[PDB]
DNA sequence: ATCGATGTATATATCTGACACGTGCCTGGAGACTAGGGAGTAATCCCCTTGGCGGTTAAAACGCGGGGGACAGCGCGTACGTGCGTTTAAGCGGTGCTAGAGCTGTCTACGACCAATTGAGCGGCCTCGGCACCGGGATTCTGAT
DNA sequence: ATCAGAATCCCGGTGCCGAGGCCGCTCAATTGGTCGTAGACAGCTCTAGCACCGCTTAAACGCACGTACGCGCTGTCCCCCGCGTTTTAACCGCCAAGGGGATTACTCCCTAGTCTCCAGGCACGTGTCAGATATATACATCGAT
C-alpha cells in the first residue's frame, strides 16, 4: 500500500486554477 | 473557441452591475470564469454522484437541489 | 362510531394533523411519537406561514398587484430581521437582490 | 403531493383579495419542507441525547425555542401551548 | 453625451428578476463539465435543472460581487480587483466562499 | 460501563508506530472525532436512503455517502479499502 | 467467533449496534458496518501517522493536542474535513 | 464585571493572532462582540439545560449547543 | 532590558497552547450572562464546561482577529481599526461573525 | 581587545503523576434457526429529451477618445509601543458543606397495531381575468445650449 | 437661466394563459379497542460543585516619552466607459426519433427476531518512566574598560 506524497499549493484551497 | 469563453464580457459586466459594482477591471473577465467553473464543478460532482447512486442514466433538478442542500446554500422552487 | 372530524377542527388549526403525524411516523426521527407533537408542529407551521404571508400580502398590495409573486417573497423575507436570520443562506428562485444604493451618490 | 391547499386556505384567511402564483406555491412548499426538516432533526437529536425514545410536546417546544430567534419563539410557544390546550376538548 | 447613466442601469438590474447569462452557452458548459469527468456518454439534463443551476450560479456570483465591492470601497478605491476577490473567497470561509 | 473507542485507537497507533504514545487528552479527542465522523456519515446515508424509497443501507449507500462526503484522493483510497474489506469479509 | 472476519481492528458488533440503535433506517445491511470499519480505520491511521511524524519532529513520544493540531493543519485535505471543528489546547499555526 | 477582560488580555489574543499594532478603540469594541457571542452560546446552553431535569449546566449541553451553532469543540464531548 | 518585545511575544504565543484569559473574570462573566435566564435561581457550572467555553471563545476570537488582520493588511497599513472588524463580521456572514 | 550582566540554548539531574499493564468480572456479541417482505428483475409503455433546420434580431464584438481614477511621493502630526515603578486581585491550598446528580423500584397511562369506514384531498377539466404588452399622451428633470 | 431630449408616469386597449373553481374518484385519516412497556415518580445516597479563608506574587495599572505611522494633498499617467458601427449566434418555431423513466408483476434471499452461551472489553489498581522542571554551562552580546 503506497502512501500518498503531499505537496503545498500556492493558495491553501485544494482547487487550483490552471 | 473554448466553451468557457461563452461567458461574455457584457454578461459578467451585467452581473457586476446587479451586484452594485461601478468600475470593473480587465482580469475580472478571466478570474470570474474560473471561480464560476469551480463552483459549478463542485455542485455538479455532488449531483452526478446522487444520480449514480440510483439506477438513472440522467440528471434532474432533484439532484441539483440535493447538491445545493448538501453544500449549505439551499435553493427553493424546485423541490416538488 | 361517531363522526370522523379532522383533528385540525378539534384543535382549531388549518394545517393537517394526520399528514404530519404520518410524516413523523415515516420520518424515522424516533421510534415513538407523542400525541401533542404533531399538533404543536402544525401550529408552529401555521404561524410561520401566516407571519410571512402578512408582509407578503402587504408588499403585494403596495406593488399594485392583486396576486403574489416570488419577487414579493424575496423582498418580504429580507426586510424582517428575524426571518432574515432564519433564512440566511437560503436562495429564492427568480428573486432579485434587495434594492440598495451605494454610499456615493450623484449630487 | 403538496401542502398547497392549506397554503391557499391560510392565504384566504389573511387576505380575501390577494392571489398567488404557481411558482410561489412551490416556494412555500419547499420552505415548509425545509422548516419541518430542521425542526424534526433537532428534535430527534435532542430526544436521543436524554435516552428517551419518544418525541413529546416538550421536545418540539424546546427545539423550536432553540431554532427560532428573536421574538418569534415566544409567539411559537404561545401558539403551541394554546393549540395543545385547546386540543384537550374532545 | 449621456453622462452618469450607469446608475440607472444598476437600478434597473436591481429591479429586474430575469436571468442575466444566456441559456445556450451555460447549457453547453454543463454538458462539457459533465462529459469531462463522469467518464460516461450521453447524460441528459432535464429542463428545470438547467434553469435552476443558472439561477443558483447567478445568485452565488452576485453575492460574491457585492461582498467584494464592499471590501474594495473599504480599501479606498472604486475599482474591483481580482486579488480582492481571491482574498474575499478565503475571508468568507470554507463554506461561504468556496 | 462507559462506551469508548480507546482500545482501537491504541491498537492502530501501536500498529503504525511501535514506539509512540497518545495522551489521555488526545485519546478523548480521537474518540469524539470518530463519533462525529460516524454521525455525519450515518446522517448522509439516512437521507440518501430516504431519497430513493429504500429502507436498507447497502454497500452502495455507504460508498456513495463516503464519496460525496469525503473530498479528495482520500475518497479514492477509502472506497478501495471498503471494497477490499467487504470482499475479505464475504470471502469465507 | 466471527469478530475479526474483515481482518480489521474496529469491532463489527459495536458499529452494527450503533447503526441499529441510531434509527437511521428501518433495516441495515451487513456490509455497511464492514465498510464503516474500513473507512474509520483508514482515517484514524492517517491522522495518527501524521501526529506521530509531528511528535517525532518535536522529539516527544507522548503526543500532545498541539501535535494533532499541527497534523491537521499541515495537511490540506484534513482542514477541508475539519474546518467546522476545532481542537482543545490547540495553538494557531506558526505564520 | 466586564472590566476583567484586561487590555493586555485582548492584546495577547491579537498577538496570538499575529496583529502587530492595535488602535486604542479595539478594547472598547472587542468586549461587545465577545459579550454578544457569549450571550448567544449561554442562551442556547441554558435552553438545553432547561429541557433537562438537572439545574447545573454541564459540558455536554455546552458542546451540544456548539454543535448546533456550527463550531464543534473536541477534547470534552464524551 | 529587552528592546522590541512584540516580535518575541508573537513568536512565543504562536508556540504556546494554554488559554490566555484568566479564569475568574471569565467565570464571573458566565455567571452574569447566566443569571438573566434562570428565572431567579442560580445555575451551577461544571469544571470542564467553563474551560470548554473559554477554549471556544479564545478560538473564535483569534480567528476573527486573524481574518480582520488580513483585511487590514489588504488596506495597506499596519494598525487595525474597529470598523474593519465590524465589516469583517458581516463579510464572514450574518451567522458566523454576527 | 577583556569583564560583566542581559538574553539565548542545551546539558544535566530530579522528581512525579500520568501512563500502561495486569486482573477480574460480565454484559454484549456470536451461533443457530425462522418467517416474511423489501428488494432485485424483467417486460412494457409513453413521456420527455435530443437533434436538426430556417429565420429573425437582439446582442456581442470591435474601435476610439477622454477623463477620472489609482498610485507614488512628501510632509505633518499624532497615537501606541517601551521602560519604569507602583499596586492589586487572581491564584494556590485547604477545609467545610449540601444541593443536587444519579441510580433504583414501581405502575400506568400512553402509544403501537389492526380492522372497518368514509370524506378530504388529488387528478383532471374548464373559463376568464389579472397581468403583460403596447401605443398615445402627460409630466418632469438634465446635460447640452 | 433655456432648451429639447430622454425618462418616467399614467392610461386605455388587447390578449392570453395561467389561476381558480368544479367534478369525480379513492385511499389515507379517523374510530374503536386491545396489549405492553417507556416513562413518570418517589426515595436514597454519595459525589462534586460551592463557599470561604488566608497567604502569596505574578500580573495589572499608570505615566512619561519618543518615534513610527495614518492621512491629506498633489501630480502624473492610464485604463476603463460611452458611443457608433459591424457581425455573429442565441432564440423561437417546427417536427421527428427514441432512450430511458416509470410502472407492474414475480420470486427469493436477506435480515429482523429470539434464545443460549461466553469472552472481548470494561473498571480498578498500581508500578514505573517520559517529560516537566530546576540548575549549571555554554554562547551571543552590549556596556564598561
Amino acid at each position: 500500500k503506497s502512501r500518498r506524497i503531499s505537496r503545498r499549493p500556492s493558495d491553501w484551497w485544494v482547487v487550483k486554477s490552471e | 473557441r473554448d466553451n468557457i469563453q461563452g461567458i461574455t464580457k457584457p454578461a459578467i459586466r451585467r452581473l457586476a452591475r446587479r451586484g452594485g459594482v461601478k468600475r470593473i477591471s480587465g482580469l475580472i473577465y478571466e478570474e470570474t470564469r474560473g471561480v464560476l467553473k469551480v463552483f459549478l464543478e463542485n455542485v455538479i460532482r455532488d449531483a452526478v454522484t446522487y444520480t449514480e447512486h440510483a439506477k438513472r442514466k440522467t440528471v434532474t433538478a432533484m439532484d441539483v437541489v440535493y447538491a445545493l442542500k448538501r453544500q449549505g446554500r439551499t435553493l427553493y422552487g424546485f423541490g416538488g | 362510531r361517531a363522526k370522523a372530524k379532522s383533528r385540525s377542527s378539534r384543535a382549531g388549526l388549518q394545517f393537517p394533523v394526520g399528514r404530519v403525524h404520518r410524516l413523523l411516523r415515516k420520518g424515522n426521527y424516533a421510534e415513538r411519537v407523542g400525541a401533542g407533537a404533531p399538533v404543536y408542529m402544525a401550529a408552529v407551521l401555521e404561524y410561520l406561514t401566516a407571519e410571512i404571508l402578512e408582509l407578503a400580502g402587504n408588499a403585494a398590495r403596495d406593488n399594485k398587484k392583486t396576486r403574489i409573486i416570488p419577487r414579493h417573497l424575496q423582498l418580504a423575507i429580507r426586510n424582517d430581521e428575524e426571518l432574515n436570520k432564519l433564512l440566511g443562506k437560503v436562495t429564492i428562485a427568480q428573486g432579485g437582490v434587495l434594492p440598495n444604493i451605494q454610499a456615493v451618490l450623484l449630487p | 403531493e403538496s401542502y398547497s391547499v392549506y397554503v391557499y386556505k391560510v392565504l384566504k384567511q389573511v387576505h380575501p383579495d390577494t392571489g398567488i402564483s404557481s411558482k410561489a406555491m412551490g416556494i412555500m412548499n419547499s420552505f415548509v419542507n425545509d422548516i419541518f426538516e430542521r425542526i424534526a432533526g433537532e428534535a430527534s437529536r435532542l430526544a436521543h441525547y436524554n435516552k428517551r425514545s419518544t418525541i413529546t410536546s416538550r421536545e418540539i417546544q424546546t427545539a423550536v425555542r432553540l431554532l427560532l430567534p428573536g421574538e418569534l419563539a415566544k409567539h411559537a410557544v404561545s401558539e403551541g401551548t394554546k393549540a395543545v390546550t385547546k386540543y384537550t376538548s374532545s | 453625451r449621456r453622462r452618469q447613466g450607469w446608475l440607472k442601469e444598476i437600478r434597473k438590474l436591481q429591479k429586474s428578476t430575469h436571468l442575466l447569462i444566456r441559456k445556450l452557452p451555460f447549457s453547453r458548459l454543463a454538458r462539457e463539465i459533465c462529459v469531462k469527468f463522469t467518464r460516461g456518454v450521453d447524460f441528459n439534463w432535464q429542463a428545470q435543472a438547467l434553469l435552476a443551476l443558472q439561477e443558483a450560479a447567478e445568485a452565488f456570483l452576485v453575492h460574491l460581487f457585492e461582498d467584494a465591492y464592499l471590501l474594495t470601497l473599504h480599501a479606498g478605491r472604486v475599482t474591483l480587483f481580482p486579488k480582492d476577490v481571491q482574498l474575499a473567497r478565503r475571508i468568507r470561509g470554507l463554506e461561504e466562499g468556496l
Side-chain angles (χ1 to χ4, degrees), chain C residues 10-13 36-47, chain D residues 57-62 64-65 72-89:
Chain C
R10 64 175 61 181
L13 301 179
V39 184
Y40 212 100
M41 178 54 59
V44 67
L45 260 294
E46 179 266 353
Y47 175 72
Chain D
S57 56
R58 292 183 62 257
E59 282 73 17
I60 180 180
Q61 176 173 331
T62 186
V64 71
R65 190 169 64 257
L72 305 185
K74 68 184 64 178
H75 301 342
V77 68
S78 61
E79 280 287 341
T81 49
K82 183 184 62 179
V84 70
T85 195
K86 190 179 180 179
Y87 167 77
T88 60
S89 300

Side-chain angles (χ1 to χ4, degrees), chain E residues 66-68 70-72 74-75 77 83-84 87-88 90-93 95-96:
Chain E
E66 60 87 14
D67 287 322
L70 259 296
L71 60 90
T72 52
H74 166 263
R77 39 178 168 84
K83 46 181 294 298
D84 311 330
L87 175 137
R90 65 192 309 267
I91 211 74
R92 292 185 65 177
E95 191 265 346
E96 297 78 12

Side-chain angles (χ1 to χ4, degrees), chain B residues 37-78:
Chain B
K37 174 186 177 182
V38 169
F39 177 81
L40 211 62
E41 201 282 329
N42 181 259
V43 174
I44 285 178
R45 188 186 72 259
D46 299 3
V48 71
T49 52
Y50 264 102
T51 61
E52 187 170 309
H53 170 257
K55 311 304 178 58
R56 295 187 173 95
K57 282 185 172 58
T58 177
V59 312
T60 178
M62 193 56 60
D63 305 270
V64 182
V65 67
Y66 288 166
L68 281 296
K69 179 60 180 300
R70 196 60 184 92
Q71 293 183 357
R73 44 191 72 259
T74 179
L75 176 61
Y76 287 174
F78 319 100

Side-chain angles (χ1 to χ4, degrees), chain B residues 1 22-25 56-58:
Chain B
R1 306 179 185 180
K22 172 187 174 182
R23 303 186 62 88
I24 208 61
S25 178
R56 295 187 173 95
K57 282 185 172 58
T58 177

Side-chain angles (χ1 to χ4, degrees), chain C residues 33-107:
Chain C
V33 54
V39 184
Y40 212 100
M41 178 54 59
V44 67
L45 260 294
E46 179 266 353
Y47 175 72
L48 288 180
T49 178
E51 186 73 31
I52 62 184
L53 278 180
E54 299 305 302
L55 269 67
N58 282 270
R61 184 187 302 178
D62 191 1
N63 289 270
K64 274 72 60 180
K65 305 301 182 303
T66 64
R67 190 160 295 157
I68 296 180
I69 60 180
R71 169 62 176 179
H72 293 150
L73 269 304
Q74 182 69 277
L75 291 181
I77 292 301
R78 302 306 177 182
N79 284 12
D80 208 285
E81 60 276 359
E82 286 79 13
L83 296 173
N84 186 24
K85 176 60 182 301
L86 178 61
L87 292 83
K89 293 179 179 179
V90 177
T91 58
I92 303 172
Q94 298 185 186
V97 190
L98 183 70
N100 57 331
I101 59 181
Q102 199 50 67
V104 178
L105 77 170
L106 63 159

Side-chain angles (χ1 to χ4, degrees), chain E residues 29-41:
Chain E
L29 176 58
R31 302 305 191 279
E32 186 268 347
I33 292 180
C34 175
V35 301
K36 181 258 304 177
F37 194 74
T38 191
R39 305 275 63 80
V41 184

